Design a protein around this ligand. Sequence first.
Ligand SMILES: CN1Cc2c(n(C[C@H](N)C(=O)O)c(=O)[nH]c2=O)C1
Ligand SMILES: [Cl-]
Ligand SMILES: [Cl-]
Ligand SMILES: [Zn+2]
Length: 254
Amino acid sequence: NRSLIVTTLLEEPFVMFRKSDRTLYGNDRFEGYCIDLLKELAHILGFSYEIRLVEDGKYGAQDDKGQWNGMVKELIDHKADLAVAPLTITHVREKAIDFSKPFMTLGVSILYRKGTPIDSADDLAKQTKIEYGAVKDGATMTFFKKSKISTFEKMWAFMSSKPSALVKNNEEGIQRTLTADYALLMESTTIEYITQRNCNLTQIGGLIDSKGYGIGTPMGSPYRDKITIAILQLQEEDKLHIMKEKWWRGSGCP
Ligand SMILES: CN1Cc2c(n(C[C@H](N)C(=O)O)c(=O)[nH]c2=O)C1
Ligand SMILES: [Cl-]
Ligand SMILES: [Cl-]
Ligand SMILES: [Zn+2]
């Protein structure tokens, strides 16, 4: 019996400040796939909400102490009721928060420029001339830091041996791929969005893993199962199909 606090962070095309000449306030400041998703969920489940951006602007990772940051920490501390963002469902996080069923499936892949002999993650691990990395304190960095596969634990050694290999956010990683000889380990959903608007970048290889995005809630929250039921309803109504195609404009790349 009160409006739910929704934590999130800005990232194209999921959550962005809507462009306008007038000054906007409240939830109307935001647009994007995740904003449309929250609006549909709020209508089905019938709740009011307030969008708040996570202060540290991080998704969530654990330090060497076991403490969380980013949106994950907001849920653990019960400072937010829902986390509506491209929040990756991982087994590790399931022990600290609850996830709905996934509303989007994805995988880790590689962002790099076109016209190159590189075709796999193993090609990056076999050399040191081409730098590579990932976003700091994200599920992608966590995947390489926790991996027990020889190739990935070697790539993680290379990522953690260079100070600027791990970037603060997507924009820094994208710009580094453009200005330097650098490949970015990034989730396939954003790669699709970028390669559709930058014809000089492409996805290298396929998906290194397979996972999904889910709505995060504090552990034991009753809204988790309700959000799952709402997500399934949106799938059945083909509304998640429309939403992706609305915000993934298309490849104008010949
Ligand atoms: C959609 N973006 C692209 C992207 C994201 N994250 C955060 C991750 N979803 C999480 O929940 O921590 C990454 O770790 N690597 C990426 O390339 C979110
Ligand atoms: Cl995992
Ligand atoms: Cl696009
Ligand atoms: Zn697509």
